[PDB]
Amino acid sequence: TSILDIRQGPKEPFRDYVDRFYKTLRAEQASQEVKNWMTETLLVQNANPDCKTILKALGPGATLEEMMTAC
Amino acid sequence: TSILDIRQGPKEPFRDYVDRFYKTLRAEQASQEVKNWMTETLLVQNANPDCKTILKALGPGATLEEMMTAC
């Protein structure tokens, strides 16, 4: 579970970050249920300071489209 | 999913940290499969600097008893 090392670059676009996050989860064969928990957690925690602050402001329970918009 | 806020105190014993991590997951009704991913990830990432460094040294794929021993 190297998912821990998938972090958002300082100037990396959230989109690019999201692509590499979910590609890693596929490899690690995560179930849709695992994919749900990781989005509410790890996706949010491994993002850059700004996005992480915006996503943490959106609240627990935001759709991926909401998070993208926010960043 | 407030699991993000369950973090290890600066001098809090790992055991105490582990109790509050898994109690929160129960409330959030996490499945055993969700409980598995969170241990390899969030449990490790929300620990204090020392433990986080030890657990990150143990490698991805360590049992909970191994992580406790390590801290």
mmCIF file of C-alpha atoms in Angstrom:
data_model
loop_
_atom_site.group_PDB
_atom_site.id
_atom_site.type_symbol
_atom_site.label_atom_id
_atom_site.label_comp_id
_atom_site.label_asym_id
_atom_site.label_seq_id
_atom_site.Cartn_x
_atom_site.Cartn_y
_atom_site.Cartn_z
ATOM 1 C CA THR A 1 0.000 0.000 0.000
ATOM 2 C CA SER A 2 2.190 2.738 -1.468
ATOM 3 C CA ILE A 3 -0.880 4.955 -1.768
ATOM 4 C CA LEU A 4 0.728 6.888 1.089
ATOM 5 C CA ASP A 5 3.360 8.242 -1.287
ATOM 6 C CA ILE A 6 0.925 9.639 -3.846
ATOM 7 C CA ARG A 7 1.073 13.330 -2.829
ATOM 8 C CA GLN A 8 0.077 16.534 -4.642
ATOM 9 C CA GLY A 9 2.954 18.528 -6.117
ATOM 10 C CA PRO A 10 3.440 22.163 -5.004
ATOM 11 C CA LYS A 11 2.158 23.464 -8.368
ATOM 12 C CA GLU A 12 0.648 20.230 -9.701
ATOM 13 C CA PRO A 13 -2.936 20.590 -10.948
ATOM 14 C CA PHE A 14 -5.472 18.772 -8.693
ATOM 15 C CA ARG A 15 -6.725 16.954 -11.795
ATOM 16 C CA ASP A 16 -3.246 15.520 -12.458
ATOM 17 C CA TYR A 17 -3.065 14.621 -8.757
ATOM 18 C CA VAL A 18 -6.466 12.893 -8.907
ATOM 19 C CA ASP A 19 -5.425 10.830 -11.960
ATOM 20 C CA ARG A 20 -2.346 9.408 -10.192
ATOM 21 C CA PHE A 21 -4.261 8.763 -6.975
ATOM 22 C CA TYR A 22 -6.988 6.606 -8.571
ATOM 23 C CA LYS A 23 -4.560 4.827 -10.927
ATOM 24 C CA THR A 24 -2.562 3.636 -7.889
ATOM 25 C CA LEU A 25 -5.729 2.417 -6.222
ATOM 26 C CA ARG A 26 -6.615 0.349 -9.295
ATOM 27 C CA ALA A 27 -3.245 -1.376 -9.149
ATOM 28 C CA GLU A 28 -3.746 -2.000 -5.442
ATOM 29 C CA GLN A 29 -7.156 -3.436 -6.476
ATOM 30 C CA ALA A 30 -9.185 -1.211 -4.149
ATOM 31 C CA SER A 31 -12.923 -1.913 -4.096
ATOM 32 C CA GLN A 32 -15.451 0.834 -4.841
ATOM 33 C CA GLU A 33 -16.089 0.944 -1.100
ATOM 34 C CA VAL A 34 -12.366 1.448 -0.452
ATOM 35 C CA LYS A 35 -12.364 4.072 -3.181
ATOM 36 C CA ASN A 36 -15.106 5.945 -1.289
ATOM 37 C CA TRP A 37 -13.282 6.119 2.053
ATOM 38 C CA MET A 38 -9.970 7.163 0.466
ATOM 39 C CA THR A 39 -11.607 10.157 -1.268
ATOM 40 C CA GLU A 40 -13.042 11.469 2.008
ATOM 41 C CA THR A 41 -9.689 10.953 3.627
ATOM 42 C CA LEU A 42 -6.367 10.256 1.874
ATOM 43 C CA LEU A 43 -7.230 12.248 -1.284
ATOM 44 C CA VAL A 44 -7.895 15.214 0.979
ATOM 45 C CA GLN A 45 -4.914 14.666 3.257
ATOM 46 C CA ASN A 46 -2.252 14.114 0.529
ATOM 47 C CA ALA A 47 -3.159 17.365 -1.330
ATOM 48 C CA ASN A 48 -1.090 20.565 -1.250
ATOM 49 C CA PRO A 49 -1.597 23.122 1.608
ATOM 50 C CA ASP A 50 -4.004 25.325 -0.335
ATOM 51 C CA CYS A 51 -6.224 22.581 -1.738
ATOM 52 C CA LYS A 52 -6.036 20.676 1.540
ATOM 53 C CA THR A 53 -7.327 23.812 3.218
ATOM 54 C CA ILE A 54 -10.079 24.311 0.648
ATOM 55 C CA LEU A 55 -11.135 20.628 0.732
ATOM 56 C CA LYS A 56 -11.046 20.668 4.553
ATOM 57 C CA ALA A 57 -13.325 23.711 4.269
ATOM 58 C CA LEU A 58 -15.800 21.902 1.944
ATOM 59 C CA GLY A 59 -16.644 19.442 4.715
ATOM 60 C CA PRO A 60 -16.657 15.655 5.092
ATOM 61 C CA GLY A 61 -19.013 14.369 2.414
ATOM 62 C CA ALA A 62 -18.090 16.185 -0.791
ATOM 63 C CA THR A 63 -18.282 14.638 -4.248
ATOM 64 C CA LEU A 64 -15.128 14.451 -6.327
ATOM 65 C CA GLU A 65 -16.570 17.008 -8.758
ATOM 66 C CA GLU A 66 -17.007 19.381 -5.831
ATOM 67 C CA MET A 67 -13.398 18.928 -4.728
ATOM 68 C CA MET A 68 -12.098 19.546 -8.263
ATOM 69 C CA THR A 69 -14.145 22.692 -8.605
ATOM 70 C CA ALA A 70 -12.832 23.857 -5.238
ATOM 71 C CA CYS A 71 -9.215 23.523 -6.480
ATOM 72 C CA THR B 1 -15.742 11.008 7.881
ATOM 73 C CA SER B 2 -14.059 12.773 10.797
ATOM 74 C CA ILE B 3 -11.474 9.992 10.916
ATOM 75 C CA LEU B 4 -9.130 12.653 9.535
ATOM 76 C CA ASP B 5 -9.098 14.396 12.907
ATOM 77 C CA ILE B 6 -8.082 11.350 14.935
ATOM 78 C CA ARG B 7 -4.361 12.156 15.364
ATOM 79 C CA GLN B 8 -1.718 10.867 17.792
ATOM 80 C CA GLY B 9 -0.866 13.208 20.661
ATOM 81 C CA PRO B 10 2.764 14.358 21.086
ATOM 82 C CA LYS B 11 3.222 12.100 24.141
ATOM 83 C CA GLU B 12 0.102 9.950 23.745
ATOM 84 C CA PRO B 13 0.770 6.201 23.902
ATOM 85 C CA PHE B 14 0.250 4.466 20.505
ATOM 86 C CA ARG B 15 -2.131 2.060 22.250
ATOM 87 C CA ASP B 16 -4.354 4.953 23.382
ATOM 88 C CA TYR B 17 -4.118 6.337 19.836
ATOM 89 C CA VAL B 18 -5.106 2.963 18.346
ATOM 90 C CA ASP B 19 -8.152 2.695 20.650
ATOM 91 C CA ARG B 20 -9.556 6.064 19.508
ATOM 92 C CA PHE B 21 -8.815 5.344 15.852
ATOM 93 C CA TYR B 22 -10.770 2.058 15.699
ATOM 94 C CA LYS B 23 -13.616 3.351 17.899
ATOM 95 C CA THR B 24 -14.210 6.174 15.386
ATOM 96 C CA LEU B 25 -14.224 3.696 12.530
ATOM 97 C CA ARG B 26 -16.901 1.621 14.272
ATOM 98 C CA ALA B 27 -19.131 4.671 14.552
ATOM 99 C CA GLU B 28 -18.503 5.443 10.892
ATOM 100 C CA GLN B 29 -19.481 1.778 10.286
ATOM 101 C CA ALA B 30 -16.306 0.885 8.388
ATOM 102 C CA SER B 31 -16.209 -2.646 6.974
ATOM 103 C CA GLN B 32 -13.369 -5.031 7.836
ATOM 104 C CA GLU B 33 -12.019 -4.312 4.361
ATOM 105 C CA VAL B 34 -12.088 -0.569 5.078
ATOM 106 C CA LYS B 35 -10.458 -1.295 8.417
ATOM 107 C CA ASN B 36 -7.601 -3.035 6.568
ATOM 108 C CA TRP B 37 -6.796 -0.153 4.208
ATOM 109 C CA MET B 38 -6.951 2.475 6.975
ATOM 110 C CA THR B 39 -4.354 0.596 9.068
ATOM 111 C CA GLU B 40 -1.864 0.511 6.185
ATOM 112 C CA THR B 41 -2.521 4.162 5.574
ATOM 113 C CA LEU B 42 -4.352 6.591 7.884
ATOM 114 C CA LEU B 43 -3.270 4.854 11.124
ATOM 115 C CA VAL B 44 0.308 5.275 9.949
ATOM 116 C CA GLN B 45 -0.108 8.805 8.630
ATOM 117 C CA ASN B 46 -1.966 10.292 11.658
ATOM 118 C CA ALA B 47 0.689 9.073 14.171
ATOM 119 C CA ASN B 48 3.292 11.304 15.836
ATOM 120 C CA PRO B 49 6.636 12.045 14.038
ATOM 121 C CA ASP B 50 8.583 9.308 15.810
ATOM 122 C CA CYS B 51 6.040 6.514 15.432
ATOM 123 C CA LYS B 52 5.208 7.670 11.914
ATOM 124 C CA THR B 53 8.893 7.317 11.131
ATOM 125 C CA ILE B 54 9.130 3.895 12.760
ATOM 126 C CA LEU B 55 5.926 2.625 11.085
ATOM 127 C CA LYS B 56 7.092 4.044 7.734
ATOM 128 C CA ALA B 57 10.296 2.077 8.363
ATOM 129 C CA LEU B 58 8.398 -1.198 9.054
ATOM 130 C CA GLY B 59 7.100 -1.229 5.483
ATOM 131 C CA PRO B 60 3.681 -1.431 3.823
ATOM 132 C CA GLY B 61 2.142 -4.674 5.045
ATOM 133 C CA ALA B 62 2.694 -4.776 8.801
ATOM 134 C CA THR B 63 0.251 -6.292 11.274
ATOM 135 C CA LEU B 64 -1.169 -4.089 14.001
ATOM 136 C CA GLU B 65 0.772 -6.065 16.618
ATOM 137 C CA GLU B 66 3.951 -5.250 14.716
ATOM 138 C CA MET B 67 3.148 -1.536 14.661
ATOM 139 C CA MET B 68 2.408 -1.503 18.405
ATOM 140 C CA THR B 69 5.645 -3.265 19.192
ATOM 141 C CA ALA B 70 7.483 -0.767 17.003
ATOM 142 C CA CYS B 71 6.086 2.149 19.074
#
